[model samples]
Target: GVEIETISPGDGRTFPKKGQTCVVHYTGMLQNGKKFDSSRDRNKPFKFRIGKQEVIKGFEEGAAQMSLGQRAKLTCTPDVAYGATGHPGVIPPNATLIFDVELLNLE
Candidate 1:
């Protein structure tokens, strides 16, 4: 079973490996489905590398499996993901996160 859906890099989407940088637009919401982050509002693309801790583990690993213009619903658990501590003020402990993300392209 595929937990993550990947889009073709030719579709303007590509997930970067570690040390590989990429540009993207994304929105992150809670389990209840509330918007938390959105690059669309800023009308800008975000640049970051995979597994560089520049982004969350779920976003990095999950996005790498996608391509630009490709949208995927990323669902993750606490450990191997956010961990029990979460981000404290930002992410609640034992919380599961859902992200509607686009991989954009390699940078």
Candidate 2:
């Protein structure tokens, strides 16, 4: 569902399995080049349980493939992202999202 283009190698870190928590930092943008969100802006790594429906479905797929310390760009089509409804005031309907993400390891 999601396409991940590795920006950095795994760097020897362990891959996080489903149900384990993943800590990550990310920046999200729409196809329009508008910056919509970023963990760096918040100054904290976001943590979530993979496969727990904690994020967009695309994100779950992207993160699942990532090893701790891995960095990549994720391409999420509407089918795997916000879909027709999208997020009000944030994502538009049928929008394709691009996320620059860094997997900081697991909890």
Candidate 3:
């Protein structure tokens, strides 16, 4: 399961629907506050299609909760994340993930 703390919930009558593309800026970190990845560092936002399974399940679940222009800090447990076989060096096995994510657009 994912726990989300909304920073900005955006303003719109509609939420993201399945099969839509989501554009977001995100900073991913470990429980110790070590950054693993960040879209900001790349100087570009990340894009993925919702319900397409293009990313980790945790990210999908977390992103699904966002609305356009919304920002949130999401905590994802291993069960919905990378599980026990996390990316070596980048993410430890069974490590919990923290992400500060902002939904930029739906395309």
Candidate 4:
């Protein structure tokens, strides 16, 4: 299952719920330390409708637990992340993805 380890807690206990649009800043890496993607280095904060399959399973499950500005170490194992084939472009096969994620807000 996807796991969450809070790096910095948010202001309060409120969390982004399913069906709510969540905006986030995230840095993604493979188990071997390859920085495959990061919102900080890219365009804009990633926004997706919760439980909508716009992102991988980990993002939905992990981001749902975070409150505004909450930072966390979101770990998505192969099962919950990219499957065996993975992303052919960069992400390796069976790679366990790790992310530094911050919930920017809900829209």
Candidate closest to the true structure, highest lDDT: 2
Q: List model 3 lDDT by residue over 18-68, tens digit each.
A: 778878898988897678898998887877788877888888888878777
Q: How many angstroms is residue 36 displaced in model 3 relative to the true structure, after the best TM-score fit? A: 0.7
Runs in model 2 deviating more than 4 A are none
lDDT for model 4 comes to 0.79
How far out, in Å, is residue 82 in model 3?
Answer: 1.8
Question: Which candidate, 1 or 2, has the higher TM-score?
Answer: 2
| TM values, all candidates | 0.75, 0.90, 0.90, 0.89
Which residue runs does candidate 1 get wrong by more than 4 Å? 5-15
lDDT at 32 for candidate 2?
A: 67
TM-score winner, 1 or 4? 4
Model 4 alpha-carbon miss at residue 96, Å: 0.5
Angstrom error of the Cα, residue 8, model 3: value is 2.6
Please give, for residues 43-63, the per-residue lDDT of candidate 2 as tens digits.
Answer: 888877877687888888888
Question: In model 3, which runs have C-alpha deviations exceeding 4 angstroms?
Answer: none
Q: Which residue pairs collide in model 1, if any?
A: 12-68, 13-67, 13-68, 14-67, 78-83
Predicted candidate 4 versus true structure: per-residue lDDT over 1-107, tens digit per residue: 77878877567577777668878888887776768898997779877787768888876688777788789898887877777888887877788888988888865
Off by over 4 Å in 4: none
